[PDB]
Amino acid sequence: LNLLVIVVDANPIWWGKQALKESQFTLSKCIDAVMVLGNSHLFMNRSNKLAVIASHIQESRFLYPGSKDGKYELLTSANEVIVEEIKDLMTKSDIKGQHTETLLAGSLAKALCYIHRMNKEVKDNQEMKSRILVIKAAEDSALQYMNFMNVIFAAQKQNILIDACVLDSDSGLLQQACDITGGLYLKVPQMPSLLQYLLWVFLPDQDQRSQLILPPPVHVDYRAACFCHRNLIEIGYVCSVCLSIFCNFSPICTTCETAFKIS
Amino acid sequence: AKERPIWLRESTVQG
Amino acid sequence: PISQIGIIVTKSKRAEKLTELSGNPRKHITSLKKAVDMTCHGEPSLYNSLSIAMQTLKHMPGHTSREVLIIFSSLTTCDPSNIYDLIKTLKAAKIRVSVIGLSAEVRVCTVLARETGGTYHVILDESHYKELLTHHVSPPPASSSSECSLIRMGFPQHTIASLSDQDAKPSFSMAEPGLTLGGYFCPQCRAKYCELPVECKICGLTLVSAPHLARSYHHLFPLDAFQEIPLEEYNGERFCYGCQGELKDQHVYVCAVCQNVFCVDCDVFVHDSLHCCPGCIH
Amino acid sequence: IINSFQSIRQEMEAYTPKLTQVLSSSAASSTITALSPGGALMQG
Amino acid sequence: LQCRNLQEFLGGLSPGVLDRLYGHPATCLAVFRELPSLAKNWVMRMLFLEQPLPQAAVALWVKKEFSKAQEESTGLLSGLRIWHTQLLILNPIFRQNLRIALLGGQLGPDKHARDVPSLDKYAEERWEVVLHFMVGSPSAAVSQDLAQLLSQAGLMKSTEPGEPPCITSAGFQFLLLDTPAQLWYFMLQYLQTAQSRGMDLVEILSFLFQLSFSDSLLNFLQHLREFGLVFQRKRKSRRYYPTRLAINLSSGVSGAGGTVHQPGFIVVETNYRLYAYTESELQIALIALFSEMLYRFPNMVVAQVTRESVQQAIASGITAQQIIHFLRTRAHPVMLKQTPVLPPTITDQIRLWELERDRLRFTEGVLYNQFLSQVDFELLLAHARELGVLVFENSAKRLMVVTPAGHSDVKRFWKRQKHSS
Amino acid sequence: TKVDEYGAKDYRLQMPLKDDHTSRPLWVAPDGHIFLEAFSPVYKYAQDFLVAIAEPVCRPTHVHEYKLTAYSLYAAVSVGLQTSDITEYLRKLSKTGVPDGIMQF
Ligand SMILES: [Zn+2]
Ligand SMILES: [Zn+2]
Ligand SMILES: [Zn+2]
Ligand SMILES: [Zn+2]
Ligand SMILES: [Zn+2]
């Protein structure tokens, strides 16, 4: 069994700027490309299953939980429910100038517990392979680092691949998330052809990914910096309590001020 | 030690 | 991740270090798979086991928590000297000792654990054994006698050949070592490494990547327990917020801060695996 | 932010377009050729 | 003619039929989901490509490992003529219908909405009565079309004009097959006999795919109801409900698991004794084909597997493999604990009894003797070998035997060789 | 006496199947043969009882076979078992009752 979760960075600031920029690629066509991927993923195998989540600066919403047009109800209903659910998010959304960073950690969290719920509801007669495809486009936030790291290790622990399909802004932690989880990361230069990357690079699952040739992952710069200056450094002094990278020795660590002794 | 021989471990009939 | 583990096998009055302290679980696990065929003959020696460990752990730094986990099987154990002196030495050496007894409630193990501050437990059943080892995975809570210290640490960056064996730097791994196309370095060793985190083979300094540290920060950010609401309590959210599934049973929990609603499976998975409240991230 | 929020709301007026209007062989081939071993996106 | 899988039928398709068979409603979905795990990716990739690409690209896109599987899958899709090299451009009808299949592009009064269990039970019931007619039951459901169908399917033959049809060698082998495999062979033969009898396979087969998710179709659909594969409360209803069996269709035992998801009932003892906790006489009839039945109880039957009953079964055409399979697939939960599930002594004895039945291998042939030289003998032998006409040889004894058909070729060659004089 | 179209002797006209036949591990044939589910939860009691009242015929791993005989019945009476006692317990063990031909026997 294969479970594919698609995460769309539906941030209205970036996509709105692109609309104001008269960008060729747009969120609608992006959601439509996601729709084709979701359909084609399920279309690939009877046991294939999927979920879709979109994120907004305020919150994230799930897009997925007769034959009047002569076609299968599941595909047709999946298309309609996804369109209706995305429109509800876009229409039912507040406006706030102070908050613009896109939510990602909360979206991945819901996906992981959803996958875990599915991992329990699935019959033990069959094994379920799960993957998360993150479609990032707008800027990340430093506050998300801690929470994003939590979900990254949970996904690794629970063997979920994080596949990153970046549109514009390249999050250093996102390119780390895939590498830590063994997922792929790519930034598309030709946003209008995003669907080709999805079907060629992101469509194949781990079993297919192994038996196939794909561009090697981009080198990941695992930067490290002291919490006092946030400057990249090769040597940092941590403590067995705060475990925080300090710039230099101090009798008291500013985050805790515990009574360290000179040495 | 004292394991069973092959003729007692598996089917000797060609099938 | 920054921790290291070692293993000792004790039989026929002797104690042998199966594998010294290292950061490679695969090496230890490889030795365990081999040890499945061990002779399993003779009597063990707690005194020799502890002393061999102490002769190793005594040279360890002060900031690192020195510890020993004893899987005691045969309640009889030969010893060349009074274990009480060794116990007093363990307290002085600040080596945390905790014993796990299988089908036995031994006196020496009782005093050894409780005097040293560690704990002595006995296997009730397979689930108890699984639970006890799972519990031991937790970092030890700091005793009022325990003191904190800083440690110098190295955060190198993995480096690779520019393009398909071009501008490469031919070298073998420090871990019949094969050639290294790419790998981490050390500012002082200048020796290339294939696997991190690891202690310097030269400088005696720990090399580690920043995510490995964050992997421990859940210990620093313990998740607050969500209040239980097993009854429906007229909660209009038929679907569980975490899994968007209708709650099939009279077991439900709500967050203390974000007030979101999660089922027992979500709450367990959150507290056991995610270690964060999905709604609190917002 | 307000302009982007309003502009995107009007951008959401069209949905479920034609796959053959959404994508083209020229765009698709450009991606495949870029991902080919000699292309811009295939490092080797 | 043991057509154990769809692939054999897929090869039995010409471009003049494939193009029509490649319809948008179901064939594209059915074919695509049946393609190998590799080719499905490339077909989906090129769904937006109007220009062909070289085979080297497909080859280099796969590792040296699994290249054989890629080649094999390439052989299938090229054999299916899904694309052309033109140097792998998809067929326009296939690409267009696959594209439409992703999105699609009809209603009326409510139906009786009969329960899915009821549908599958009478479907199983319908298949059972078909098998009750197939077996030597003294009374069973009959129909002129059903009878001739089973006969043209090579499962039954009428020994005398007016006497009830009897079972053929293939029919006995067929009877022991599992329901999905057994149904598959029937579906395949119906399809082949349909085109033979003038029913347009294109429409009915495409309809079978649709059921897995015209007057010709109505006639065909009537047979499907008689097969219990579809429910229709009354012949007047323009709408029907596909049964589980029809939904499964060509999915095979790989889809939704094998028919083994049923209560086991056969117990096999080391003394060749059988105890089958059953009331369904069909199972009894099948068991009687190879075992001597001793006692019958309200819920169980006692039988013994003897040389007589087994060698009789083998003589009729059955194989120990089918017998062992029939038992293993029906083995009672209690004997599932032991491994192997069947007692090795039993399995070995049954195999050994069939292997005894064919101790002598009989082969038609023509033997030449008294070869005047080893050279011309080996020369003629090399020609027989080159023709693949050789049956057996002993050059040390200077002898060889060849197939009667091939003999005419060596007879001609021998005369030609002799006429060189 | 009664035989189906197949060589097996049938006893539908001879004995019924009890409501909890699944719990009862034994069958009684009108010809005196007896079968016992060796894997049944009460097998222990049934084995002892059948060794007491009947003659073992086959004792394979899953289903044992016994037959009644005058000698085996005398042995049952030799341990003080009354006709009612063996009948009552046999009926209780039998998932298909006791055939009257055997009862009068
Ligand atoms: Zn500190
Ligand atoms: Zn500083
Ligand atoms: Zn160093
Ligand atoms: Zn939940
Ligand atoms: Zn909470």
mmCIF file of all heavy atoms in Angstrom, chain A residues 110 113 116-117 120 147 153 156 219 234-238 240 243 258 260-261, chain C residues 63 147-149 151 153 155-156 158 211 215 217 241-243 265 269 276:
data_model
loop_
_atom_site.group_PDB
_atom_site.id
_atom_site.type_symbol
_atom_site.label_atom_id
_atom_site.label_comp_id
_atom_site.label_asym_id
_atom_site.label_seq_id
_atom_site.Cartn_x
_atom_site.Cartn_y
_atom_site.Cartn_z
ATOM 1 N N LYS A 110 -0.174 17.282 11.696
ATOM 2 C CA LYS A 110 -1.468 16.662 11.427
ATOM 3 C C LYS A 110 -1.324 15.486 10.467
ATOM 4 O O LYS A 110 -1.962 14.442 10.647
ATOM 5 C CB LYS A 110 -2.439 17.703 10.871
ATOM 6 C CG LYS A 110 -2.837 18.768 11.882
ATOM 7 C CD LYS A 110 -3.939 19.667 11.348
ATOM 8 C CE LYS A 110 -5.264 18.931 11.273
ATOM 9 N NZ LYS A 110 -6.399 19.849 10.976
ATOM 10 N N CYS A 113 0.229 12.388 12.415
ATOM 11 C CA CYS A 113 -0.730 11.675 13.254
ATOM 12 C C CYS A 113 -1.825 11.047 12.402
ATOM 13 O O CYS A 113 -2.370 9.999 12.770
ATOM 14 C CB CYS A 113 -1.319 12.589 14.330
ATOM 15 S SG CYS A 113 -1.899 14.192 13.783
ATOM 16 N N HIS A 116 -0.279 7.952 11.195
ATOM 17 C CA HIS A 116 -0.248 6.989 12.288
ATOM 18 C C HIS A 116 -1.627 6.384 12.509
ATOM 19 O O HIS A 116 -1.751 5.178 12.755
ATOM 20 C CB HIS A 116 0.254 7.662 13.565
ATOM 21 C CG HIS A 116 0.492 6.712 14.697
ATOM 22 N ND1 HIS A 116 1.477 5.749 14.668
ATOM 23 C CD2 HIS A 116 -0.126 6.582 15.896
ATOM 24 C CE1 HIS A 116 1.455 5.065 15.798
ATOM 25 N NE2 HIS A 116 0.491 5.551 16.561
ATOM 26 N N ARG A 117 -2.677 7.207 12.447
ATOM 27 C CA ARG A 117 -4.031 6.678 12.564
ATOM 28 C C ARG A 117 -4.293 5.679 11.444
ATOM 29 O O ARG A 117 -4.826 4.587 11.675
ATOM 30 C CB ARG A 117 -5.046 7.825 12.548
ATOM 31 C CG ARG A 117 -6.504 7.409 12.722
ATOM 32 C CD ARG A 117 -7.206 7.176 11.392
ATOM 33 N NE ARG A 117 -7.487 8.428 10.701
ATOM 34 C CZ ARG A 117 -8.344 8.551 9.696
ATOM 35 N NH1 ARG A 117 -8.918 7.496 9.142
ATOM 36 N NH2 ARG A 117 -8.602 9.762 9.209
ATOM 37 N N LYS A 120 -2.680 2.397 11.909
ATOM 38 C CA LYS A 120 -3.390 1.510 12.819
ATOM 39 C C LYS A 120 -4.664 0.971 12.185
ATOM 40 O O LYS A 120 -5.006 -0.200 12.381
ATOM 41 C CB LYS A 120 -3.730 2.247 14.117
ATOM 42 C CG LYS A 120 -2.567 2.425 15.077
ATOM 43 C CD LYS A 120 -3.068 2.707 16.485
ATOM 44 C CE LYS A 120 -1.927 2.750 17.487
ATOM 45 N NZ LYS A 120 -2.427 2.752 18.889
ATOM 46 N N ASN A 147 9.913 23.224 16.053
ATOM 47 C CA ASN A 147 8.746 22.393 15.766
ATOM 48 C C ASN A 147 8.925 21.571 14.493
ATOM 49 O O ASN A 147 8.461 20.428 14.416
ATOM 50 C CB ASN A 147 7.501 23.271 15.659
ATOM 51 C CG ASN A 147 7.086 23.857 16.992
ATOM 52 O OD1 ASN A 147 6.928 23.138 17.976
ATOM 53 N ND2 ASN A 147 6.905 25.172 17.030
ATOM 54 N N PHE A 153 12.173 14.373 12.903
ATOM 55 C CA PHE A 153 12.640 13.146 13.540
ATOM 56 C C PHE A 153 11.508 12.142 13.716
ATOM 57 O O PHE A 153 11.743 10.932 13.626
ATOM 58 C CB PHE A 153 13.315 13.465 14.871
ATOM 59 C CG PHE A 153 14.603 14.215 14.717
ATOM 60 C CD1 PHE A 153 14.884 15.321 15.496
ATOM 61 C CD2 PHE A 153 15.535 13.811 13.775
ATOM 62 C CE1 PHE A 153 16.073 16.004 15.339
ATOM 63 C CE2 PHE A 153 16.723 14.493 13.616
ATOM 64 C CZ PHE A 153 16.992 15.590 14.400
ATOM 65 N N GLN A 156 11.215 10.451 10.416
ATOM 66 C CA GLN A 156 12.330 9.519 10.280
ATOM 67 C C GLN A 156 12.114 8.290 11.152
ATOM 68 O O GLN A 156 12.306 7.153 10.703
ATOM 69 C CB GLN A 156 13.642 10.216 10.643
ATOM 70 C CG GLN A 156 14.886 9.474 10.191
ATOM 71 C CD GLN A 156 16.152 10.035 10.806
ATOM 72 O OE1 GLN A 156 16.110 10.698 11.844
ATOM 73 N NE2 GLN A 156 17.287 9.775 10.168
ATOM 74 N N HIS A 219 23.699 19.163 -2.174
ATOM 75 C CA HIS A 219 24.508 19.110 -0.963
ATOM 76 C C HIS A 219 23.825 19.929 0.123
ATOM 77 O O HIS A 219 23.380 21.055 -0.115
ATOM 78 C CB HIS A 219 25.918 19.636 -1.231
ATOM 79 C CG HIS A 219 26.702 19.925 0.012
ATOM 80 N ND1 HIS A 219 26.624 21.128 0.680
ATOM 81 C CD2 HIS A 219 27.576 19.164 0.710
ATOM 82 C CE1 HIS A 219 27.418 21.095 1.736
ATOM 83 N NE2 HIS A 219 28.008 19.915 1.776
ATOM 84 N N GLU A 234 32.571 26.677 13.290
ATOM 85 C CA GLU A 234 32.955 25.272 13.275
ATOM 86 C C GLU A 234 33.086 24.682 14.670
ATOM 87 O O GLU A 234 32.913 23.469 14.840
ATOM 88 C CB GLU A 234 34.281 25.105 12.527
ATOM 89 C CG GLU A 234 34.500 23.740 11.889
ATOM 90 C CD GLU A 234 33.715 23.554 10.602
ATOM 91 O OE1 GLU A 234 32.897 24.435 10.259
ATOM 92 O OE2 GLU A 234 33.932 22.532 9.920
ATOM 93 N N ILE A 235 33.379 25.508 15.670
ATOM 94 C CA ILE A 235 33.515 25.072 17.054
ATOM 95 C C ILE A 235 32.563 25.874 17.929
ATOM 96 O O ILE A 235 32.561 27.110 17.892
ATOM 97 C CB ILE A 235 34.962 25.216 17.559
ATOM 98 C CG1 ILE A 235 35.947 24.607 16.559
ATOM 99 C CG2 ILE A 235 35.116 24.569 18.927
ATOM 100 C CD1 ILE A 235 35.767 23.117 16.366
ATOM 101 N N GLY A 236 31.767 25.162 18.711
ATOM 102 C CA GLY A 236 30.814 25.781 19.614
ATOM 103 C C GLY A 236 30.883 25.057 20.941
ATOM 104 O O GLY A 236 31.204 23.869 21.003
ATOM 105 N N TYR A 237 30.577 25.784 22.011
ATOM 106 C CA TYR A 237 30.638 25.212 23.352
ATOM 107 C C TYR A 237 29.223 24.988 23.870
ATOM 108 O O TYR A 237 28.492 25.947 24.141
ATOM 109 C CB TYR A 237 31.405 26.128 24.308
ATOM 110 C CG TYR A 237 32.786 26.583 23.858
ATOM 111 C CD1 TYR A 237 33.469 27.560 24.571
ATOM 112 C CD2 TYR A 237 33.407 26.042 22.738
ATOM 113 C CE1 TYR A 237 34.722 27.990 24.179
ATOM 114 C CE2 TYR A 237 34.653 26.479 22.328
ATOM 115 C CZ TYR A 237 35.308 27.446 23.058
ATOM 116 O OH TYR A 237 36.560 27.866 22.671
ATOM 117 N N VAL A 238 28.849 23.722 24.005
ATOM 118 C CA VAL A 238 27.554 23.345 24.525
ATOM 119 C C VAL A 238 27.717 22.959 25.991
ATOM 120 O O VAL A 238 28.824 22.758 26.485
ATOM 121 C CB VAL A 238 26.905 22.211 23.696
ATOM 122 C CG1 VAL A 238 26.844 22.599 22.227
ATOM 123 C CG2 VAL A 238 27.666 20.915 23.874
ATOM 124 N N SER A 240 25.991 20.401 29.245
ATOM 125 C CA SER A 240 25.239 19.174 29.521
ATOM 126 C C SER A 240 23.875 19.436 30.165
ATOM 127 O O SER A 240 23.251 18.495 30.677
ATOM 128 C CB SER A 240 26.066 18.247 30.413
ATOM 129 O OG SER A 240 25.643 16.901 30.279
ATOM 130 N N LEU A 243 22.420 22.472 26.586
ATOM 131 C CA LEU A 243 22.741 21.897 25.276
ATOM 132 C C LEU A 243 22.684 22.950 24.170
ATOM 133 O O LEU A 243 22.311 22.666 23.030
ATOM 134 C CB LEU A 243 21.821 20.714 24.958
ATOM 135 C CG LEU A 243 22.343 19.694 23.944
ATOM 136 C CD1 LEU A 243 23.560 18.973 24.502
ATOM 137 C CD2 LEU A 243 21.255 18.701 23.568
ATOM 138 N N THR A 258 23.275 28.516 35.118
ATOM 139 C CA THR A 258 23.728 27.525 36.081
ATOM 140 C C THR A 258 25.173 27.799 36.489
ATOM 141 O O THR A 258 25.964 28.372 35.736
ATOM 142 C CB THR A 258 23.588 26.122 35.487
ATOM 143 O OG1 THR A 258 23.879 25.136 36.487
ATOM 144 C CG2 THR A 258 24.506 25.951 34.284
ATOM 145 N N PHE A 260 28.359 27.080 36.571
ATOM 146 C CA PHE A 260 29.514 26.358 36.058
ATOM 147 C C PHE A 260 30.777 26.847 36.769
ATOM 148 O O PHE A 260 30.838 27.967 37.282
ATOM 149 C CB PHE A 260 29.640 26.525 34.542
ATOM 150 C CG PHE A 260 30.747 25.708 33.929
ATOM 151 C CD1 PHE A 260 31.011 24.422 34.371
ATOM 152 C CD2 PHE A 260 31.523 26.227 32.907
ATOM 153 C CE1 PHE A 260 32.038 23.682 33.818
ATOM 154 C CE2 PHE A 260 32.541 25.480 32.341
ATOM 155 C CZ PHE A 260 32.797 24.208 32.797
ATOM 156 N N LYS A 261 31.796 25.993 36.791
ATOM 157 C CA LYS A 261 33.066 26.306 37.426
ATOM 158 C C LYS A 261 34.166 26.446 36.381
ATOM 159 O O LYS A 261 34.149 25.776 35.343
ATOM 160 C CB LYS A 261 33.447 25.233 38.453
ATOM 161 C CG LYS A 261 33.879 23.907 37.851
ATOM 162 C CD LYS A 261 34.293 22.921 38.930
ATOM 163 C CE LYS A 261 33.087 22.418 39.707
ATOM 164 N NZ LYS A 261 32.252 21.489 38.895
ATOM 165 N N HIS C 63 31.710 16.180 32.814
ATOM 166 C CA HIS C 63 30.426 16.649 32.302
ATOM 167 C C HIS C 63 29.560 15.509 31.788
ATOM 168 O O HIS C 63 28.330 15.621 31.788
ATOM 169 C CB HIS C 63 30.640 17.666 31.182
ATOM 170 C CG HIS C 63 30.972 17.048 29.861
ATOM 171 N ND1 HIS C 63 32.162 16.397 29.620
ATOM 172 C CD2 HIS C 63 30.261 16.967 28.711
ATOM 173 C CE1 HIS C 63 32.175 15.951 28.376
ATOM 174 N NE2 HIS C 63 31.032 16.284 27.804
ATOM 175 N N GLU C 147 26.619 17.768 39.303
ATOM 176 C CA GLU C 147 26.986 19.111 38.884
ATOM 177 C C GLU C 147 27.094 19.180 37.367
ATOM 178 O O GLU C 147 27.410 18.191 36.698
ATOM 179 C CB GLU C 147 28.308 19.554 39.523
ATOM 180 C CG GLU C 147 28.174 19.999 40.970
ATOM 181 C CD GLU C 147 29.466 20.559 41.530
ATOM 182 O OE1 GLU C 147 30.423 20.745 40.748
ATOM 183 O OE2 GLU C 147 29.525 20.814 42.751
ATOM 184 N N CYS C 148 26.823 20.368 36.839
ATOM 185 C CA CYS C 148 26.832 20.662 35.415
ATOM 186 C C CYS C 148 28.203 21.139 34.949
ATOM 187 O O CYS C 148 29.008 21.663 35.723
ATOM 188 C CB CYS C 148 25.789 21.730 35.098
ATOM 189 S SG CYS C 148 26.321 23.382 35.581
ATOM 190 N N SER C 149 28.461 20.945 33.656
ATOM 191 C CA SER C 149 29.697 21.409 33.049
ATOM 192 C C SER C 149 29.494 21.656 31.559
ATOM 193 O O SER C 149 28.654 21.021 30.915
ATOM 194 C CB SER C 149 30.837 20.409 33.273
ATOM 195 O OG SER C 149 32.030 20.837 32.638
ATOM 196 N N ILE C 151 31.193 21.743 27.610
ATOM 197 C CA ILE C 151 32.062 20.874 26.824
ATOM 198 C C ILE C 151 32.361 21.499 25.467
ATOM 199 O O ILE C 151 31.468 22.026 24.794
ATOM 200 C CB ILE C 151 31.442 19.468 26.658
ATOM 201 C CG1 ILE C 151 32.285 18.607 25.713
ATOM 202 C CG2 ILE C 151 30.000 19.563 26.191
ATOM 203 C CD1 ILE C 151 33.674 18.307 26.230
ATOM 204 N N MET C 153 32.966 21.434 21.657
ATOM 205 C CA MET C 153 32.403 20.557 20.643
ATOM 206 C C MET C 153 32.641 21.104 19.241
ATOM 207 O O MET C 153 32.683 22.318 19.018
ATOM 208 C CB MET C 153 30.901 20.373 20.898
ATOM 209 C CG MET C 153 30.230 19.266 20.119
ATOM 210 S SD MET C 153 28.642 18.864 20.872
ATOM 211 C CE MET C 153 29.176 17.913 22.293
ATOM 212 N N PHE C 155 31.606 21.174 15.146
ATOM 213 C CA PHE C 155 30.468 21.114 14.230
ATOM 214 C C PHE C 155 30.956 21.213 12.786
ATOM 215 O O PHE C 155 30.797 22.253 12.133
ATOM 216 C CB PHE C 155 29.472 22.226 14.544
ATOM 217 C CG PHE C 155 28.957 22.198 15.955
ATOM 218 C CD1 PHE C 155 29.637 22.857 16.967
ATOM 219 C CD2 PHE C 155 27.798 21.510 16.272
ATOM 220 C CE1 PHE C 155 29.170 22.833 18.267
ATOM 221 C CE2 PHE C 155 27.325 21.482 17.571
ATOM 222 C CZ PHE C 155 28.013 22.145 18.569
ATOM 223 N N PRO C 156 31.554 20.147 12.258
ATOM 224 C CA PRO C 156 32.064 20.181 10.884
ATOM 225 C C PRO C 156 30.952 20.098 9.847
ATOM 226 O O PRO C 156 29.792 19.799 10.140
ATOM 227 C CB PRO C 156 32.974 18.953 10.816
ATOM 228 C CG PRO C 156 32.309 17.975 11.720
ATOM 229 C CD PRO C 156 31.768 18.827 12.871
ATOM 230 N N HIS C 158 29.958 18.431 6.020
ATOM 231 C CA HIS C 158 30.216 17.432 4.990
ATOM 232 C C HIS C 158 30.623 18.093 3.676
ATOM 233 O O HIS C 158 30.012 19.072 3.239
ATOM 234 C CB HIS C 158 28.971 16.569 4.780
ATOM 235 C CG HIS C 158 29.156 15.459 3.792
ATOM 236 N ND1 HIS C 158 29.464 14.171 4.171
ATOM 237 C CD2 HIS C 158 29.066 15.442 2.440
ATOM 238 C CE1 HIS C 158 29.559 13.407 3.097
ATOM 239 N NE2 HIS C 158 29.324 14.156 2.034
ATOM 240 N N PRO C 211 21.375 19.109 13.863
ATOM 241 C CA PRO C 211 20.109 18.402 14.120
ATOM 242 C C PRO C 211 20.209 17.350 15.211
ATOM 243 O O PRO C 211 19.210 17.085 15.893
ATOM 244 C CB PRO C 211 19.763 17.773 12.757
ATOM 245 C CG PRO C 211 20.397 18.676 11.770
ATOM 246 C CD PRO C 211 21.712 19.050 12.435
ATOM 247 N N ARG C 215 17.569 16.809 18.317
ATOM 248 C CA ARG C 215 16.916 15.532 18.582
ATOM 249 C C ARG C 215 16.741 15.270 20.071
ATOM 250 O O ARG C 215 15.914 14.434 20.446
ATOM 251 C CB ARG C 215 17.715 14.391 17.953
ATOM 252 C CG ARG C 215 16.888 13.159 17.634
ATOM 253 C CD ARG C 215 17.772 12.001 17.215
ATOM 254 N NE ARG C 215 18.367 12.205 15.901
ATOM 255 C CZ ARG C 215 17.956 11.604 14.793
ATOM 256 N NH1 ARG C 215 16.906 10.800 14.791
ATOM 257 N NH2 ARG C 215 18.603 11.831 13.653
ATOM 258 N N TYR C 217 16.281 18.028 22.300
ATOM 259 C CA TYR C 217 15.594 19.168 22.904
ATOM 260 C C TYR C 217 14.184 18.847 23.387
ATOM 261 O O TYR C 217 13.618 19.643 24.144
ATOM 262 C CB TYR C 217 15.536 20.362 21.943
ATOM 263 C CG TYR C 217 16.881 20.924 21.535
ATOM 264 C CD1 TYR C 217 16.986 21.819 20.477
ATOM 265 C CD2 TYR C 217 18.032 20.623 22.252
ATOM 266 C CE1 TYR C 217 18.209 22.351 20.108
ATOM 267 C CE2 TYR C 217 19.261 21.133 21.877
ATOM 268 C CZ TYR C 217 19.344 22.002 20.810
ATOM 269 O OH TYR C 217 20.559 22.545 20.462
ATOM 270 N N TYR C 241 -9.390 16.357 15.686
ATOM 271 C CA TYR C 241 -8.610 17.384 14.999
ATOM 272 C C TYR C 241 -7.293 16.841 14.452
ATOM 273 O O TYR C 241 -6.875 17.217 13.351
ATOM 274 C CB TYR C 241 -8.349 18.560 15.940
ATOM 275 C CG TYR C 241 -7.596 19.708 15.306
ATOM 276 C CD1 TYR C 241 -8.268 20.722 14.639
ATOM 277 C CD2 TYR C 241 -6.210 19.780 15.381
ATOM 278 C CE1 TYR C 241 -7.583 21.774 14.062
ATOM 279 C CE2 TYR C 241 -5.516 20.825 14.804
ATOM 280 C CZ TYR C 241 -6.207 21.820 14.149
ATOM 281 O OH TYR C 241 -5.520 22.863 13.572
ATOM 282 N N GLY C 242 -6.626 15.955 15.192
ATOM 283 C CA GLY C 242 -5.357 15.431 14.714
ATOM 284 C C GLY C 242 -5.479 14.480 13.537
ATOM 285 O O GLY C 242 -4.679 14.540 12.598
ATOM 286 N N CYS C 243 -6.487 13.610 13.545
ATOM 287 C CA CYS C 243 -6.621 12.594 12.508
ATOM 288 C C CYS C 243 -7.878 12.736 11.660
ATOM 289 O O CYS C 243 -8.095 11.904 10.771
ATOM 290 C CB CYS C 243 -6.586 11.189 13.126
ATOM 291 S SG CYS C 243 -7.958 10.813 14.240
ATOM 292 N N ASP C 265 -5.362 7.934 20.372
ATOM 293 C CA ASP C 265 -4.263 7.558 19.486
ATOM 294 C C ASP C 265 -3.418 8.773 19.119
ATOM 295 O O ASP C 265 -2.185 8.687 19.072
ATOM 296 C CB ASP C 265 -4.813 6.886 18.229
ATOM 297 C CG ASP C 265 -5.649 5.664 18.541
ATOM 298 O OD1 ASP C 265 -5.073 4.635 18.953
ATOM 299 O OD2 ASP C 265 -6.886 5.731 18.377
ATOM 300 N N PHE C 269 0.382 9.223 20.301
ATOM 301 C CA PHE C 269 1.371 9.457 19.251
ATOM 302 C C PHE C 269 2.061 10.804 19.426
ATOM 303 O O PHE C 269 3.269 10.930 19.194
ATOM 304 C CB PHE C 269 0.708 9.378 17.878
ATOM 305 C CG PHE C 269 1.661 9.577 16.735
ATOM 306 C CD1 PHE C 269 2.610 8.616 16.431
ATOM 307 C CD2 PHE C 269 1.611 10.731 15.971
ATOM 308 C CE1 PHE C 269 3.487 8.800 15.378
ATOM 309 C CE2 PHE C 269 2.487 10.920 14.919
ATOM 310 C CZ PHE C 269 3.426 9.954 14.623
ATOM 311 N N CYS C 276 4.869 17.273 20.579
ATOM 312 C CA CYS C 276 4.438 18.655 20.427
ATOM 313 C C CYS C 276 2.945 18.672 20.154
ATOM 314 O O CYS C 276 2.408 17.771 19.507
ATOM 315 C CB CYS C 276 5.198 19.374 19.308
ATOM 316 S SG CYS C 276 4.962 21.161 19.312
#
